[PDB]
C-alpha cells in the first residue's frame, strides 16, 4: 500500500536491532514483518516477500553459501533471528509464513482453543426441544435464532454471527433462559463480557429489559446475570503493568461466559481471555461477521466466521433437525467439522426486511459495487438518499440538509423544554465522518457546524466562554465514579441553576454534571466510524473525503450503513464509493492454514 | 576567571566511587570477588568507609 | 485584649495607566507571502531602514534577508515589488516617496499625549460618530476610564510644498489574493480593525505638535 511503502521508524529500528550484522534480506524481512504487524496483518507470506519486492534478486547476490541460499526458508533459518519454534527467537517461521514470537504464540493459542478444546456437551434433546418450543413462539418455518440457541447450548464454544437489528439480544435471552431451565439443580454463575464500557452498559440494560419479560422462578431469578464487565476488568488488567489477576494460575470461577461484540477483540486480548478460561466453562461469542476490524493488530472474528459460508456438517444437520424439529440444511464438504459446527449465520432481520433499502444495501456492500449502485438507484426504497459532495455549494447543501436533520433538536432546544426530550431528539440524527482533522474530519465538521450556528440565528455562542448552551460533548476516557463511559453523549444547557451537562443514563435517569467535573470533552456533531460502534441512530449521514485514504474501505461503509435504523444519507463521490467496496481490509493470518489441517 | 561553585560534592564523589568500582571490581574472577564481597557489599559501603 | 483590623474608607488610587491605541481595542508573489506579526514587523523594519531617495540595490535586499533569515528566492521579486511600491505616488496631487528628502521625513515619531478627564467611551464614541463617516456601522468598543498618558508611534510624518502629511503602514492582509482590495474592502478593513480612533489620535497629536512648535498655526 501507500502507507506500507513509507516505513515507520519503529520498523526500521526493529530491523536494524534484530538483524544487525546479518544479511540485508533478514533486515528487509524484519522491516516488512514489523510494518505488517503495525498495519494489523498477523502473518507475512513468503510469496509476497519474494515476488513483490524489487530488492529480491539483490539479496540473492548478498548471500554466499554452498547451496547459495536460494530459498527464503534456508536464508531465514541460517540467521539466529528466525527459528522453527524451538529456540527463543523473535521471529518464527513454521508454515512458510513468517510472524513474530508473540503473534505466533497467540495464533497457536487461538488455534488450540478453536480446534481441540471445543468438545460436544451431550444433554437431553427432548427437554431442550421442549424448552425451545416453549420459549420461541415461531415454530412454523425456519428460524435461525432457534438453531443458534440450540447450537450454542449444545457445544461448549460457539460463535453467533449476526448483524444489527436481527434480534441478537433476544436470542441471548432465550439461550440463557433455556440454559437455566435445562440445568435446574446445577448452579450457573453466568458472566457477561464486553470490550468497552458503553457496550457493557447497553448489554446490561438490554438483558435487564429482556430477561425480566420471560417468566422465571424464585431460584431462577436469583441466578440472573447481574452485570456485564469490561474485558480488561474481568481479567484484571492494570494501567502500569500487564500482569493479570487470573492470568495462568487461577482461572475465573465461571460457568458460562457470554462475550458481546467480538469484532472489536484483537488477538492479544483474545489470547489473554483464552488463557484465563477453565476446562469446563462454555463461551458464547457475539458480533457481526462483516463488521469493522479490531483496534490493535489481529482479526479473530473474521477469520473464525470466514468458514460460515460453507455450512454445517452432514451429521450436525441431522442433529439440528432433531433438536429444533425443523428442516436444517447441510453444508457441502467437510474441512474442519468442529469450527463449522460451532459457527452460525443470522440472515432473518426482524427490525427491517426486504421492503427497506437498508438491509438490501447492507447485503449489497459485501457484493460488488454495481449491486450497491442498483440498490441506491431504483426508487430509493424511501430510506436511502444520495447527495454528491464535490465543491463548496455541495458543502452548503450538506449543511442545509444537516439543518433539517437537527431540526427537532434545535426546536426542542429553543423552546426551553426538559433535557430528556432534547437528548431523545439528539440521539435520532447523527453524522459519521472518517478522518479527524482537515476540511473532512471531526474537528473540521464540528467547527464548520459551530460557525454555521453562529451565522444563522439558531444557537448563541460566546467566543471566549467555551461552554455555551446547546453544545454536545462526549467523553474519551472511562469514569466509574461519575457513571459515564467512553462514547457517551451529553448536552450542555441551563436548567436555571447554571450551565450543566445532562447525560442520559441507561438506567432510565438523567444526570446533571458540572462541566468542570468532566475529565474529557470533545464536540460530537460528527462522530468517527470507529468510535460510533455499539450505538444506534435513527437517521445517519455518512460523509466521506474525496482524497483516497486507507480508512475508507468495505467494512467502514458496512458499519456506516448498519448504523442507521430507518434513514441513511450519503455525501461521497461515486468513484470513492466504488473503490471502497472492492478494497477489502484483508489481514493475513495463519488461522486459514491451521484450521485447514 | 569565571567558575561555578557547587555546595554538595557528594554526588560527584559517589559517581567517582562508582567509576572506581566499575573499573576495579568488575573484571575480577570469582575467587577475588568473593573476598571483595566479604569486605564490602557495594561501593556505598566503601564510600561510607 | 480586643483588636480590630482597619477598614479602608477611600480607594488607594484612581484608574491611572499608561496605555496606547491597542489597549483601548507565479510561485513567488506578495499574495503568497507568509502572513504573521513577525513578517509584518520585518516589512516595517525594511520600510524604516531603506532610504527613499537612494535606488534599491538587490544585494542590499539579499543582505537584509540574510540578516532576517527569510528565503533567498524571494529577493529578486522583493526588490522589484519594493521599487513598484516606491514608484506609485500616494497623494491627491500625485507626490511619490522619492521626492522626500532626509530633512523632510520623520520616521517613527513617538508621542505621549496627556489626558486629565476620565475617558468615557459613550461620550467619546458619539463625538466620533458625529463627524467620522466611517462610523456608520462598527458598534462601539468598551474600555475603562483612562486618566493619564496615551503612547503612540507614528510611522512617518513628511512635509511637501509647505504642507504636512502623515503616513502609516499596514501589512497583515491575509484574506485577499486577487485584485479585490478596492476602496470598499479597505474601508471594511478600517471598520473591522478599528483604525479610525488611531488615525484620529494621530491627527490630534500632530495638531498639538504643530500648534506647540509653529507659532500662528492653522489646521
Amino acid at each position: 500500500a501507500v502507507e506500507h511503502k513509507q516505513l515507520r521508524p519503529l520498523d526500521v529500528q526493529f530491523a536494524l536491532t534484530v538483524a544487525g550484522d546479518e544479511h540485508p534480506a533478514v533486515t528487509l524481512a524484519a522491516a516488512l514483518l514489523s510494518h505488517d504487524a503495525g498495519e494489523g496483518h498477523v502473518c507475512l507470506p513468503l510469496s509476497r516477500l519474494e515476488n513483490n519486492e524489487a530488492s529480491h534478486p539483490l539479496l540473492a547476490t548478498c548471500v554466499s553459501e554452498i547451496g547459495e541460499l536460494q530459498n527464503w526458508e534456508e536464508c531465514l533459518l541460517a540467521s539466529q533471528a528466525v527459528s522453527r519454534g524451538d529456540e527463543p527467537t523473535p521471529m518464527i517461521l513454521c508454515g512458510d509464513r513468517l510472524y513474530l514470537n508473540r503473534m505466533w504464540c497467540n495464533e497457536r493459542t487461538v488455534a488450540r482453543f478453536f480446534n481441540e478444546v471445543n468438545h460436544a456437551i451431550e444433554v437431553d434433546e427432548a427437554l431442550l426441544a421442549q424448552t425451545l418450543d416453549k420459549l420461541f413462539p415461531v415454530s412454523d418455518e425456519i428460524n435461525w435464532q432457534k438453531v443458534a440457541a440450540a447450537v450454542a447450548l449444545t457445544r461448549r464454544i460457539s460463535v453467533i454471527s449476526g448483524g444489527p437489528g436481527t434480534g441478537k439480544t433476544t436470542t441471548v435471552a432465550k439461550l440463557l433462559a433455556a440454559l437455566i431451565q435445562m440445568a435446574d439443580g446445577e448452579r450457573c454463575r453466568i458472566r457477561l463480557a464486553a470490550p468497552t464500557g458503553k457496550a457493557a452498559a447497553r448489554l446490561t440494560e438490554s438483558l435487564g429489559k429482556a430477561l425480566r419479560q420471560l417468566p422465571l422462578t424464585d431460584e431462577q431469578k436469583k441466578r440472573i446475570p447481574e452485570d456485564a464487565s469490561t474485558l480488561h476488568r474481568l481479567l484484571g488488567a492494570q494501567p502500569g503493568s500487564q500482569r493479570l489477576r487470573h492470568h495462568a494460575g487461577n482461572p475465573l470461577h465461571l460457568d458460562v461466559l457470554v462475550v458481546d461484540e467480538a469484532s472489536m477483540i484483537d488477538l492479544p486480548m483474545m489470547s489473554r481471555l483464552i488463557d484465563a478460561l477453565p476446562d469446563h466453562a462454555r463461551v458464547i461469542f457475539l458480533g457481526d461477521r462483516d463488521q469493522l476490524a479490531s483496534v490493535e493488530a489481529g482479526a479473530v472474528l473474521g477469520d473464525i466466521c470466514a468458514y460460515a459460508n460453507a455450512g454445517f456438517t452432514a451429521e450436525r444437520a441431522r442433529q439440528l433437525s432433531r433438536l429444533t424439529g425443523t428442516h436444517v440444511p447441510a453444508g457441502t464438504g467437510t474441512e474442519a467439522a468442529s469450527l463449522r459446527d460451532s459457527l452460525c449465520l443470522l440472515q432473518k432481520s426482524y427490525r427491517f426486511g426486504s421492503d427497506s433499502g437498508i438491509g438490501q444495501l447492507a447485503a449489497a456492500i459485501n457484493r460488488g459495487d454495481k449491486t450497491a449502485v442498483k440498490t441506491v438507484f431504483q426508487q430509493d426504497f424511501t430510506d436511502i438518499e444520495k447527495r454528491l459532495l464535490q465543491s463548496g455549494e455541495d458543502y452548503i447543501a450538506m449543511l442545509e440538509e444537516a439543518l433539517a436533520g437537527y431540526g427537532r433538536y434545535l426546536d426542542l432546544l429553543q423552546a426551553r423544554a426538559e433535557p430528556d426530550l432534547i437528548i431523545q431528539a439528539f440521539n435520532e440524527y447523527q453524522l459519521l465522518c472518517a478522518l479527524r482533522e482537515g476540511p473532512f474530519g471531526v474537528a473540521g465538521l464540528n467547527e464548520r457546524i459551530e460557525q454555521f450556528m453562529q451565522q444563522k440565528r439558531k444557537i448563541h455562542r460566546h467566543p471566549h466562554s467555551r461552554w455555551y448552551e446547546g453544545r454536545p460533548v462526549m467523553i474519551a476516557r472511562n469514569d466509574s465514579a461519575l457513571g459515564l463511559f467512553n462514547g457517551d453523549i451529553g448536552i450542555a444547557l441551563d436548567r436555571g441553576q447554571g450551565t450543566r451537562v445532562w447525560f442520559a443514563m441507561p438506567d432510565g435517569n438523567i444526570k446533571s454534571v458540572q462541566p468542570s467535573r468532566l475529565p474529557e470533552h470533545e464536540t460530537t456533531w460528527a462522530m468517527t466510524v470507529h468510535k460510533s460502534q455499539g450505538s444506534e441512530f435513527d437517521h445517519a449521514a455518512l460523509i466521506l473525503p474525496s482524497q483516497r485514504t486507507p480508512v475508507v474501505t468495505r467494512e467502514l461503509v458496512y458499519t456506516a450503513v448498519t448504523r442507521a435504523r430507518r434513514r441513511l444519507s450519503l455525501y461521497a463521490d461515486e468513484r470513492i464509493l466504488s473503490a471502497a467496496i472492492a478494497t477489502r481490509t484483508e489481514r493475513r493470518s495463519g488461522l486459514a492454514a491451521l484450521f485447514s489441517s | 576567571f569565571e567558575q561555578q561553585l557547587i555546595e554538595d560534592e557528594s554526588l560527584l564523589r559517589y559517581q567517582a566511587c562508582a567509576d572506581f568500582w566499575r573499573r576495579h571490581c568488575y573484571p575480577l574472577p570469582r575467587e577475588i570477588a568473593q573476598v571483595v564481597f566479604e569486605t564490602w557489599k557495594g561501593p556505598q559501603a566503601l564510600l561510607r568507609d | 485584649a480586643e483588636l480590630n483590623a482597619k477598614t479602608l474608607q477611600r480607594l488607594p488610587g484612581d484608574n491611572w495607566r499608561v496605555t496606547s491605541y491597542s489597549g483601548l481595542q507565479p510561485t513567488l508573489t506578495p499574495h503568497q507571502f507568509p502572513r504573521g506579526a513577525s513578517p509584518g514587523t520585518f516589512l516595517h523594519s525594511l520600510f524604516e531602514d531603506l532610504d527613499f531617495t537612494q535606488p534599491v540595490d538587490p544585494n542590499w535586499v539579499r543582505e537584509k534577508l540574510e540578516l532576517g533569515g527569510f528565503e533567498s528566492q524571494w529577493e529578486p521579486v522583493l526588490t522589484e515589488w519594493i521599487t513598484a511600491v516606491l514608484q506609485a505616488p500616494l497623494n491627491e496631487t500625485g507626490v511619490s516617496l522619492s521626492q522626500l528628502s532626509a530633512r523632510n521625513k520623520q520616521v517613527e515619531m513617538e508621542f505621549y499625549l496627556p489626558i486629565s478627564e476620565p475617558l468615557i467611551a459613550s461620550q467619546l464614541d458619539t463625538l466620533i460618530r458625529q463627524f467620522d463617516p466611517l462610523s456608520a456601522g462598527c458598534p462601539p468598543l468598551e474600555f475603562m476610564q483612562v486618566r493619564g498618558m496615551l503612547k503612540g508611534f507614528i510611522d512617518l510624518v513628511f512635509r511637501h510644498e509647505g504642507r504636512y502629511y502623515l503616513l502609516a503602514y499596514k501589512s497583515n492582509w491575509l484574506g485577499e489574493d486577487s485584485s479585490a482590495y478596492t476602496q470598499q474592502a479597505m474601508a471594511a478593513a478600517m471598520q473591522a480593525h478599528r483604525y479610525d480612533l488611531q488615525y484620529q489620535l494621530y491627527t490630534l497629536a500632530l495638531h498639538r505638535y504643530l500648534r506647540h512648535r509653529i507659532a500662528d498655526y492653522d489646521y
Binding site: R8, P9, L10, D11, V12, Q13, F14, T17, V18, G38, Q80, P88, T89, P90, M91, L100, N101, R102, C105, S241, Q242, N250, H253, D266, P268, E296, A297 | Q15, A18, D19, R22, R23, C25, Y26, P27, L28, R30, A33, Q34, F37, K41, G42, Q44 | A1, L3, N4, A5, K6, L8, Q9, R10, P12, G13, W16, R17, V18, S38, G69, G148, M149
Partner: protein, 747 residues
C-alpha cells in the same frame, strides 16, 4: 522611619501595610508619586509580587515591578544548552527525560504527553540508567558491561514488542512484556531520538574552524526541534546569537580550530545577559532598583534591603587593572556609585522616607546589622535631633532614645496580636484578624460514630484487606480516601546490591521455582538477562547466597507438601454470607510459604484462612513457613470455636467501618506476646511485664535509624501526631481483645 523586620516576605508585607496607611492618611497622595527601590531586586521581587497579588479587591493597589527580563522560552534554551553539551554528557536517563519534558522536542519526534508518561515507566522498569551506546561506555575508560544502557533498553523493548517474556532470552536480553501492541510505536520514536543523539555526539566531538560552525545550529534546530507558535522567537534568538558569535569571530579572521566548549560558554553567557528593566509606568506603583530614577522627585520613597553585605555592593577588582592602582576623578566604581545613589534617594524624598532592612534572622533569631550608610544616618539623626519628652537628659541617652523611637521592631509572624493593637502601628490584613484574635474552633478528633449497616454478602477478600491493615481499610474503603504518594525517581547507577522490593521479588520467584524443583540456573540467566542482577561475579555470589537461603527454606517447605487444589467457601455467619476461594488446599491442611520475616500480619492472615477453612469441613493444621526458621502453626478446631472466632472477626470488621479500629498488628502483637504466658494460658499483671511491654511497644511502633517503624506511616499520622498514653492503652485493649487467639493457638 526605620523598620526592622525578620523576613523579606515579612518586610514587603509590612511595607504594603505602611504604604496603605500612608495612602489612607494623606488624601492628596496619588499612587504614581510612590516609589520602592530595592537593593537586591532578584531576591525580593517574588515576595513583592506575592504580597501584592494576594490583596483583595477592596485592598488592591496597582503595582508594576521592574526586574531582570525572563527568558522567552525557558526550557527550550536550557535544552539547547544541554544539546550543546552532548559529547560531554553521560547520557543519564533523567537527563534525557528532562529533554523530553520540553514539548518542542516531544512534538518534533511525535511524542505526546501520554506517550511521555508511558515512556517514564518504560525507562524506569526496563533498566535504563546511563550510556547511549557501548562505545560510549568504552570511551569513558570503563569496562563494557553490555547491560543497563540505552541500546540495552532499546533492544529489550524491541524484543518485548516481538517476543513474550515467558519464552526466554535470545541474545542474553530478556524481553519487556509491557510494550507489545501499537503503543510500542512510541518506542520507535524514542529510538528515533537516541540515534539522533548518536549523530551529534560523534559530530560535535571534533574541533572545527569558525567557517564550519555555521550550519551546525540550524541543522540542530531542524533536527531536534519543531517550530511552534510560541518558540519561534527562541529559535530566532538562538540563530541570531550564533550567527553574531561566528560573525564576530570571522571579523578577526581566526584560522585555528575552535572547540565546542568555548562556543557553548559564549552562548550561555549571551543568553543570560538579560539586563534589569528600567521601564517606568506612571500608572501603577513602580517597584524598581536604585539607578533608574536617581533624581526623580517622588513624594514617598521606600528603600528595601539596606542590611550589611547586600548594600552597598562591593565589587572585587580584576587584580591587574591600572585604573584601580591609580584612581582619577572620572573613574567608575560601584561602591561610590551606590553611596551616591543612597544620597540621591535621601535628597529625592519629598514627603515620606521609609527605610526597611533585615535586622533579625528568621532561622536562629540572630542579630543582623544594617548598612554603614543607614548607621551613619541614624547616628546623624540621634546627634542632630531630640525628643520633647527628655529635653535635658544626656547626649548619648537622648540619641539612643531617638534611635529606638524611630526604629519600629515589627513582629516575626503576621498572625501576632501585637500588630493588631490600636495606636501607631496597625495592620490592614483582614485575613489574619480572626487568626490573631484566637477566637476560632480547634481541630476536632477524626474518629466519629458513623452509621454502617453490615451487608448480606461480604467477601473473604474484603476481610483479608481489612485484617491486613485496619486503619488503611477504614480510610480507603469506608470514606474512600487513599493517600497516594508519588513514585520514586530512577536511580543514577546500576544495582550493585539487592534491597527492598527487587530483592523480595527475586526471592519470591526463586521460592516459587524451588518449590517445583525447577532449574535455578535458568532463572539465574533469566534474571541476569533483565539486568536485575549485579554484573559479573557479584550477581553470581548474590544468586548463590539467595539460592542457599531459598533451598534451606524449600527443604522445610516440600518436606510436608502434598498436591492440593483451590476449593470454594460458602459460609453463613451471623446472617452474613461469605463467598470466597481458597488456593492449594491439601488434605494435610493449609500450606503457605512467603520469603518474609516473622510478623503478626501474616499470622493474622493465616489465622483468618484457618478459620475460613475449618468452618466448612477440613480437619487439619495450618502452617506458614517464613525466613530464619519462622513458623506459624494453628491446630485444627471444631466448627463451634471456628464459627465463634469468625463471628468475633465479623464483629470487628463491622466495628472497623463505623469507627477506626485501633488494632496495631506489630506493636499490639509485641505487647501481647510480652504480656502473654502460653504455659498457664493467663496474662501476667506484674509491673516488670508492664515495663517490658511498654519497651516492646515503643520498639515496634517507632523503630531505629535502620528499620522503618510502624509509627512512620501516612495512615497513622492522620489520626494522631504524637502517641498519647490514652490511645496507647486503647490500642493495647483492642489488641488484647482481637489478637489474643493468635498467640493462644500458636505452636
Amino acid at each position: 522611619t526605620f523598620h526592622v523586620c525578620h523576613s523579606p516576605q515579612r518586610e514587603v508585607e509590612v511595607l504594603h501595610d505602611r504604604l496603605l496607611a500612608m495612602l489612607e492618611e494623606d488624601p492628596t497622595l496619588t499612587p504614581r508619586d510612590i516609589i520602592v527601590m530595592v537593593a537586591d531586586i532578584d531576591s525580593y521581587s517574588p515576595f513583592i509580587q506575592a504580597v501584592f497579588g494576594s490583596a483583595p479587591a477592596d485592598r488592591y493597589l496597582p503595582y508594576a515591578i521592574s526586574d531582570r527580563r525572563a527568558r522567552q522560552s525557558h526550557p527550550v534554551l536550557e535544552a539547547f544548552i544541554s544539546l550543546l553539551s552532548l559529547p560531554d554528557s553521560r547520557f543519564v536517563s533523567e537527563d534525557v527525560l528532562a529533554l523530553l519534558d520540553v514539548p518542542v522536542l516531544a512534538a518534533r519526534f511525535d511524542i505526546t504527553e501520554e506517550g511521555l508518561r508511558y515512556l517514564r515507566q518504560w525507562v524506569n522498569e526496563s533498566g535504563i540508567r546511563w550510556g547511549i551506546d557501548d562505545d560510549n561506555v568504552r570511551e569513558l575508560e570503563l569496562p563494557a558491561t553490555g547491560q543497563h544502557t540505552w541500546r540495552f533498553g532499546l533492544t529489550r523493548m524491541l524484543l518485548g514488542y516481538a517476543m513474550e517474556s515467558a519464552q526466554g532470552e535470545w541474545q542474553s536480553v530478556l524481553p519487556y512484556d509491557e510494550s507489545s501492541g501499537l503503543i510500542a510505536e512510541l518506542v520507535g520514536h524514542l529510538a528515533s531520538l537516541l540515534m539522533q543523539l548518536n549523530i551529534w555526539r560523534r559530530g560535535l566531538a571534533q574541533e572545527r574552524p569558525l567557517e564550519e560552525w555555521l550550519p551546525v545550529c540550524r541543522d540542530m534546530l531542524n533536527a531536534f526541534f519543531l517550530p511552534d507558535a510560541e518558540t519561534e522567537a527562541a529559535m530566532t534568538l538562538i540563530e541570531q546569537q550564533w550567527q553574531a558569535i561566528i560573525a564576530e569571530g570571522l571579523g578577526a579572521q581566526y584560522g585555528d580550530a575552535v572547540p565546542l566548549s568555548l562556543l557553548r560558554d559564549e552562548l550561555a553567557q549571551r543568553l543570560d545577559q538579560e539586563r534589569i528593566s528600567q521601564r517606568f509606568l506612571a500608572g501603577p506603583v513602580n517597584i524598581c532598583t536604585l539607578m533608574p530614577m536617581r533624581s526623580i522627585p517622588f513624594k514617598v520613597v521606600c528603600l528595601l534591603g539596606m542590611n550589611d553585605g547586600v548594600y552597598p555592593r562591593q565589587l572585587a577588582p580584576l587584580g591587574f587593572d591600572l585604573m584601580s592602582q591609580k584612581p582619577k576623578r572620572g573613574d567608575r566604581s560601584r561602591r561610590d556609585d551606590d553611596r551616591y545613589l543612597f544620597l540621591e534617594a535621601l535628597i529625592s524624598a519629598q514627603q515620606k522616607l521609609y527605610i526597611s532592612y533585615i535586622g533579625r534572622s528568621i532561622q536562629d533569631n540572630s542579630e543582623r546589622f544594617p548598612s554603614v550608610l543607614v548607621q551613619e544616618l541614624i547616628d546623624y539623626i540621634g546627634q542632630s535631633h531630640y525628643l520633647p519628652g527628655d529635653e535635658a537628659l544626656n547626649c548619648d541617652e537622648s540619641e539612643a532614645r531617638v534611635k529606638a523611637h524611630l526604629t519600629c521592631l515589627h513582629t516575626r509572624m503576621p498572625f501576632d496580636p501585637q500588630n493588631y493593637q490600636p495606636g501607631e502601628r496597625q495592620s490592614y490584613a483582614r485575613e489574619w484578624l480572626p487568626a490573631a484574635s484566637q477566637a476560632g474552633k480547634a481541630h476536632s478528633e477524626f474518629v466519629q460514630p458513623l452509621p454502617f449497616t453490615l451487608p448480606e454478602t461480604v467477601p473473604l477478600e474484603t476481610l483479608q484487606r481489612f485484617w491486613a491493615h485496619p486503619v488503611r481499610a477504614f480510610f480507603q474503603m469506608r470514606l474512600q480516601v487513599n493517600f497516594r504518594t508519588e513514585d520514586s525517581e530512577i536511580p543514577d547507577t546500576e544495582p550493585f546490591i539487592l534491597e527492598g522490593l527487587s530483592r523480595y521479588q527475586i526471592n519470591q520467584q526463586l521460592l516459587n521455582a524451588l518449590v517445583e524443583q525447577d532449574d535455578a540456573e535458568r532463572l539465574f540467566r533469566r534474571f541476569r538477562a533483565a539486568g536485575d542482577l549485579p554484573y559479573g561475579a557479584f550477581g553470581e555470589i548474590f544468586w548463590e547466597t539467595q539460592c542457599q537461603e531459598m533451598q534451606q527454606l524449600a527443604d522445610r517447605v516440600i518436606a510436608c507438601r502434598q498436591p492440593g487444589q483451590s476449593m470454594e467457601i460458602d459460609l453463613a455467619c451471623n446472617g452474613v454470607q461469605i463467598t470466597g476461594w481458597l488456593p492449594q488446599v491439601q488434605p494435610d491442611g493449609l500450606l503457605r510459604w512467603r520469603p518474609s520475616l516473622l510478623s503478626v500480619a501474616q499470622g493474622m492472615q493465616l489465622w483468618l484462612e484457618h478459620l475460613v477453612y475449618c468452618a466448612s469441613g477440613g480437619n487439619g493444621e495450618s502452617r506458614l513457613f517464613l525466613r530464619k526458621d519462622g513458623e506459624w502453626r494453628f491446630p485444627p478446631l471444631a466448627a463451634e470455636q471456628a464459627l465463634h472466632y469468625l463471628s468475633q472477626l465479623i464483629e470487628g470488621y463491622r466495628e472497623g467501618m463505623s469507627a477506626p479500629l485501633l488494632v496495631l498488628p506489630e506493636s499490639g502483637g509485641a505487647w501481647l506476646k510480652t504480656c502473654y504466658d502460653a504455659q498457664n494460658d493467663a496474662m501476667l499483671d506484674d509491673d516488670s511485664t508492664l515495663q517490658k511491654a511498654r519497651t516492646k511497644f515503643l520498639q515496634a511502633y517507632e523503630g531505629n535509624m535502620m528499620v522503618r517503624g510502624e509509627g512512620d506511616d501516612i495512615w497513622y499520622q492522620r489520626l494522631w501526631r504524637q502517641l498519647t498514653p490514652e490511645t496507647m492503652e486503647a490500642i493495647v485493649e483492642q489488641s488484647q481483645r482481637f489478637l489474643l487467639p493468635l498467640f493462644r493457638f500458636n505452636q
